[PDB]
Amino acid sequence: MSAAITEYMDVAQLTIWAFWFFFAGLIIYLRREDKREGYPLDSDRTERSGGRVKVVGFPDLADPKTFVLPHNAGTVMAPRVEAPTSINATPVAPFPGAPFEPNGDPMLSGFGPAASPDRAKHCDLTFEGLPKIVPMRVATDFSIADKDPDPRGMTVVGLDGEVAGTISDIWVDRSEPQIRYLEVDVSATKKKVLLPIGFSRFDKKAGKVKVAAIKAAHFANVPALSKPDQITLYEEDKVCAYYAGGKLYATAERAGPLL
């Protein structure tokens, strides 16, 4: 029982080698956990082989893991199969790794920055089973903090500083009190559209809302809700993606380059 195993080896060397073995095992485990979403990959190697060679890399995938959702919403497998889709674009060039062109009208195309998957068509729920994101017209116990603007009646201006409507209601979150959406009453179609907070800037001096994503004339194509009191995971994603597409498709100068 000493510190020298041989003429060259000692304890502090064996300990570091044992750590390296454990670290290799841990890295394999973490990389296997990383591969529960989006694998097996979609490449030319699979389709040339007639759907025979599946590209997963190393290490391969794990056995499916089960999540059970509350209030009897169902069960979801962490590694699952999903239906291959047909995109709304067309390749710019036939060589591999080439970009695609957003066929049609880019805002109303569902491709690029204006793209989204199809989530479940049910509202997110609280711990008691109520809808989670609701307007303040039904969450009456809520209130605006003191010494704060209360953005009701504020005019919303578009990308070019042209007014596109006014705020009508505020959609809040019952579980965590914060604002998730603004409701804009568009004065071009007599309709009401939702606007995420992440795409709006509060000019509290002059009482304005700035939307730098889309222009004033684009507020007429925002996807609408099914019922005026609640929203689903599908519609929220669609609404956010429509505004996100304007970060590239709004004007002719936003595609680049600088030089």
Binding site: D10, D34, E37, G198, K204
Partner: protein, 318 residues
């Protein structure tokens, strides 16, 4: 320019939330919650309530006794002069017994108070660990947090208790002070030959830098996709939306591989824990199986060599 979601522009007030009901046989939560406006610009503007059981009361008592002993000895070291106590506060400390006692109990002024303070502080830390385990299990959750706290406690006990017992003396332990314990940290490296050459020290530093890198990347990633609802990570884990897809695709295009919304939080968990695990080993090997880390590195061909441009004559080798 564009809203970066760093501060909350407009706040909304709802009534206080007592919390998820606890099962039978639990005490009620104490305190009435209140709201802070300035605290609500960066996070949640609600403070309280708190749960205090029996383990939580015992932890408080033990810890306050330990801290009172430490403070009383710091005050006694300046002969009861409170002004001089304020002047020298960062330099004062309570320090371990002398090396001529081994693992015995010295008088109070010569290291008994240090032993009592260490025992009581260790008891409070253990009781707080039990409290965290019990609160995790009361709500039906798992026990990851208690495992991470157990790793931290393992490093703490290696630093203060296990290594001195292995070396056979209490003088190897760290003092209770601000500048005193930094002095201990410097002297430990000097005595055992340049701790930079300890390979577990190298691994621990790598994991600390990695924790900082991982938290910066994850925070920036979640803040960048929060316009799509990305901050609600549980929903994205159980139902993948555009936030998770864009976050994965960004990193896949940047560095060739990516993680998942669920999987990244594992990379976060293991990176931090391995910071302290490799730390606790690194000092248990020091002084027990390795005497000089620089000479150990030279023996294993790790230390670099430089041209001889300055040198000294050895007066012990004449």
């Amino acid at each position: 320019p564009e809203y970066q979601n760093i501060f909350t522009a407009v706040q909304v007030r709802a009534p206080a939330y007592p919390g998820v009901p606890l099962p039978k046989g639990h005490l009620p939560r104490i305190g009435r919650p209140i709201f802070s406006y300035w605290l609500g610009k960066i996070g949640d503007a609600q403070i309280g309530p708190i749960y205090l059981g029996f383990t939580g009361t015992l932890s408080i008592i033990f810890g306050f006794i330990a801290i009172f002993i430490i403070g009383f000895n710091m005050l006694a070291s300046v002969d009861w002069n409170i002004i001089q106590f304020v002047k020298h506060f960062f330099w004062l400390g309570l320090e371990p017994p002398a090396p001529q006692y081994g693992l015995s109990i010295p008088p109070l002024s010569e290291g008994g108070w240090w032993l009592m303070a260490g025992f009581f502080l260790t008891m409070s830390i253990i009781l707080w660990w039990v409290r965290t385990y019990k609160r995790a299990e009361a709500l039906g959750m798992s026990q990851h947090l208690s495992w991470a706290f157990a790793a931290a406690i393992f490093f703490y006990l290696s630093l203060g208790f296990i290594r001195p017992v292995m070396m056979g003396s209490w003088a190897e332990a760290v003092p209770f002070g601000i500048f005193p314990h930094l002095d201990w940290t410097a002297a430990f490296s000097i005595r055992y030959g340049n701790l930079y050459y300890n390979p577990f020290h190298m691994l621990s530093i790598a994991f600390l830098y990695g924790s900082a890198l991982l938290f910066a990347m994850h925070g920036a990633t979640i803040l960048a996709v929060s316009r799509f609802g990305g901050d609600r990570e549980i929903d994205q884990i159980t139902d993948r939306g555009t936030a998770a897809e864009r976050a994965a695709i960004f990193w896949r295009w940047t560095m060739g591989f990516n993680a998942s919304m669920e999987s990244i939080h594992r990379w976060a968990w293991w990176c931090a824990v391995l910071t302290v695990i490799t730390a606790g080993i690194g000092i248990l090997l020091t002084g027990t199986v390795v005497e000089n880390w620089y000479l150990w590195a030279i023996k294993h061909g790790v230390a670099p060599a430089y041209p001889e441009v300055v040198t000294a004559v050895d007066p012990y080798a004449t």
